[PDB]
Structures are given as C-alpha cells and as structure tokens.
Amino acid sequence: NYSVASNVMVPMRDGVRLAVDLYRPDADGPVPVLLVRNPYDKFDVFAWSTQSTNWLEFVRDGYAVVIQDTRGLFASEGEFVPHVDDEADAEDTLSWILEQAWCDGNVGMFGVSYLGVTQWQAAVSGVGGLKAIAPSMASADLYRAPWYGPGGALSVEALLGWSALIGTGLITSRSDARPEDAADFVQLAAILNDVAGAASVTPLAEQPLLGRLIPWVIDQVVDHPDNDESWQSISLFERLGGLATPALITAGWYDGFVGESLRTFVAVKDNADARLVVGPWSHSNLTGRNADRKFGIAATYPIQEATTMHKAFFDRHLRGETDALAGVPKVRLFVMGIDEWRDETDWPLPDTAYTPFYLGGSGAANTSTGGGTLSTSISGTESADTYLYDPADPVPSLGGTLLFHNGDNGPADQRPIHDRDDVLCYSTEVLTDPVEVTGTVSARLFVSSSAVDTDFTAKLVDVFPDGRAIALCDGIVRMRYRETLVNPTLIEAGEIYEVAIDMLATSNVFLPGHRIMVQVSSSNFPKYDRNSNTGGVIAREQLEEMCTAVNRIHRGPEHPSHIVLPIIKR
Length: 570
Ligand SMILES: *[B]([O])([O])C1=[C][C]=[C][C]=[C]1
Description:
Blueprint: E1 2-11, E2 17-25, E3 31-38, H1 46-49, H2 56-60, E4 64-69, H3 86-99, E5 103-112, H4 114-123, E6 130-136, H5 143-147, H6 156-171, H7 181-193, H8 195-199, H9 210-213, H10 216-222, H11 229-232, H12 237-240, E7 247-254, H13 258-268, E8 274-282, E9 289-290, E10 293-294, H14 303-317, E11 331-335, E12 340-344, E13 353-360, E14 373-375, E15 383-389, E16 424-427, E17 435-449, E18 455-463, E19 469-478, E20 497-510, E21 515-521, E22 549-555, E23 562-568
Parallel strand pairs: 3-4, 3-5, 5-6, 6-7, 7-8, 8-11
Antiparallel strand pairs: 1-2, 2-4, 9-10, 11-12, 13-14, 13-23, 15-22, 16-21, 17-20, 17-22, 17-23, 18-19, 18-21
Bound molecules: phenyl boronic acid.
C-alpha cells in the first residue's frame, strides 16, 4: 500500500521552487528513494513509463518515488532553458530528499531519454546519498548526442523535432492563455508532420517560430557548430571516469543516443557495478516491429523483465542486499540476424577482432548495380569512384538513428535510394557461413573534394536474399572537423585525406545467403544538416550561395579505404 502527495514545492539554492510528486509506501520508518526529473509533466506518468519500467512495483515493494517537473515547466517556478540548470537543480533536489523524514539516506534514479540525461547531471554532483542511477537511451555529452555528433554535423531533425515538442509543452503551461497560442499549435504540428521540410529552410538559423518560443534553439545549438566552451560546460563525460556510482544503462541499436549510451558504460565499468542492456529499438519504436523488418515478440521492450532487473539492481545498491544481482549478466544484447537475446561479460566483447573490409571492384561503384566490392584482402588496382554532391538534392535519410523525422523504422530498406549516382555501394559476395558483427563500427576512407569543405557518410547494410537492403549503423564526417571537433581547419581541393567515420555500433549476424554492404555518400538529410561545400557558417548560408562538390573516394594498395568490422567468431 502507498500514498501520493501532489505539488510538494522544493526550494533550490536561488529560491526558485520546483514541484514534485511523492509516491510513498505505508511503512513504519524511513525508506530508500528513487528520483525522476521530467520536462514533460510529472503528472503525465503514462507518456514515458511504457519506455521504462512498471515502477509502481518499486513503491509496492517499499521504495519511495519522487517525480519532479524541471525548472520553468508545468508546476515548477523559474525559467526553462535545456540542460544548463539540471546539475544544480538535481543536487539541491537530492539534498532535500536526504533531509526528509521518509528517506533512509539511500537515493537512486531511473528514466529514459531526457529523464536519463538528467541522471548523469545528478551523478557528477558528488552527493554521497546517491547510490545508483539507471539511465536509458541517454547521453553524457550533449554535443555528441543528440544535437550534433562525433562527426561534427548538426542533427537538424533531432533539434527541430524536439524543440517543437517542447514548444507544445511550454505553451500549455505558461501564464494565461494567449491569442497567438492557437496559431502556434498548428505551426508546431506542421514542423512535426514534415521535419525534413522544416529543416530545408535557408538560412537554417532563421527560425521565426522556434526561435521565439525557445531562443536556445538558435542561441546555443545552431550558433555553436564547434564543440566549444558552451558545450563543454554542460558535458558530463570527462567527469564520469572519476565517479564510483553504479549504473544500469539501457540503449537501442537504432536509438539516436546509442553511441553515447554505450560510451557511458565503458567510462564507468571499471570503478563501479555497471550493467548494460541493448535492444533493436529506435527512440519512438520499442515494439520490435518495423515496416520491412520484424525482430520477433521477444524483441518487444521487456518492461516486466526490466522492472525485475532494476529492482534487483536497486536492492543491491540502495538496500545492501549483496546477492540481489545473482544470475544477472553484466551485459545483455539483442543480436540481430539470429534475432536472439544473448548474455555477455563485457562491452566491447572480449573476443572482438577489429577486421578491415576493403573497398574495391572493377569499374565505377556508383549505384547498387555498380562494381563495388568488400573484401578482407587489400585491393590490387588503384581506382577511384567519383560523384557530384548537390546540397539542393541530398541523399534522404531512411531509418538508422533518426529521432523525430520518420524515427520509427530504424532497420529501413535502402532500395529507394539505390538508384542514386551519389550513393556508392560496396558489397561482399553472397555469404556461405555466418559472420557476426558486434561492437563499435568505424570507417577509414581516403577522400578528395573539389571544395574546401564537404561531408562523407558511411552506412553498414545487411542485404537479404529477397532483395531487402536493411540499414544497420551509420556515421558522418564533416571535413573541417576531420581531426578535431573543437578547432576546425579547411581542406585543399584535389588533395587526398585519410578520414575516420564513427559509425556508432551494432550487433548483427549476417546469415548465409546474405551480403555485407557499405554505402558511401556525402549527405544523409535530415539526420544531419547539408554541408554547403563552401567552408562558411553552414547554418547562416542561403541555398543560392551554396556550391556543388565533385567528391572522390580512393581505393587500392596505396589508398586502402576500408570499414573496420568488430568480428565475433563462436
Ligand atoms: B528524449 O527525451 O525522448 C529526447 C531528448 C532530447 C532529444 C530527443 C529525444
């Protein structure tokens, strides 16, 4: 049995009061507490909970749960600006919880997405009472995920889509109903119905609606393309290695935060009890069912199993039950292809063979019907594949790690974009034996451009016997950020550069009858904004002042372009 207290006002260091809801068990004395920091209304528990845990079970089992409205939203006072106030607000909320009569000195956290990012922001405070966190589909470096990326390109669909979602929330919670609210609601809906079209406006920085409702969209995100001091100020990643806080980390292979979610596991595993669970989900699709790819009912987000695991995790760290995690694996991955859940002892997998698969083939590799090949052997002849990248006609984003723009079809069939001359395809011969690729994926390409800046993309694909070319993982490298995301430099026209493309991670068994395929291009819109091919401030440029670029991929003995695949042999 339990009770629920609504709108308990918690004072922050500056006097601003944040509203919390208290779910407290009918107990004799103090109990362990779990905190959730939410920017989408603490009252609306059903909206996020289905992507997390059946957490009322925690309350029925003796835990107190506190759900808070973040600063400036809904029942909370103050002004809302994403990320900047969460470290301090979390520290003050954790301190308040610890001071209460119903708290036994043990606090934990759980939640998904922004409710996951806020946990990393709470973890770096150094509050002794915080014994464990459980961040799902989260990031500890906001530049790397979800706003930009390891390649330095703006995740424009993520930005405009989320800003429009928050804009809808900021309006239905402010001081009195304004006459322009009705018109603004329709305009925000127009952005959510066509994020690609909203991202196609030039200059990208000119956002009349979003820039008015939430200035941060331009002031912080669009205006800061480099991983500068403004981003480092809200980044938690470098402080993660110094922590000794247990973390139950959940991720999804097609989730926009996957690269960063996995990196947080690697950062905390040595100093504390870190756990990892990765399924085949995208941010908005946790069903395991997609348009052209079904992973089976076992792939559907196992909410009750997740609840049991979280309870066992919290029982060990908040209650002191030393044997609570007995039989529970360190890492649990959904291996695609064979479509089965598998227990592992570590991430990256102990037996990982980082194997180069070289780009080769006779003739031009343009289109799926070209001569592009992939092999573990170095190509014998020096060749080059050339194409024209026009910002007015970018390669459309199809699946992958899309968040808001068609973000419910991660393992998308790539056939609709196969006819494009700007999509270079490289494939292995039809496999006779299974090849498992589980781990971080990257590419090393020898490239040249006619422009002083451009982008280069790489996408890993599983070609099915029936024709389906299913996307797995992808990445991008904006040339000015080839060596560093902090201090960019331009490239010289015609000169060959060896660049690295971070393609995040995947777990897939390429079964017999299938082919391993890699797509190389210079755009992936709106997953990433279009490079202007000018070397200018991309988001401030007009479409008419943008240039086309004649891009080239070099392959052979002296230029061994390849994709590094994390091969597991069992
Ligand atoms: B999550 O809360 O669903 C989220 C947060 C920031 C950007 C995209 C998604």
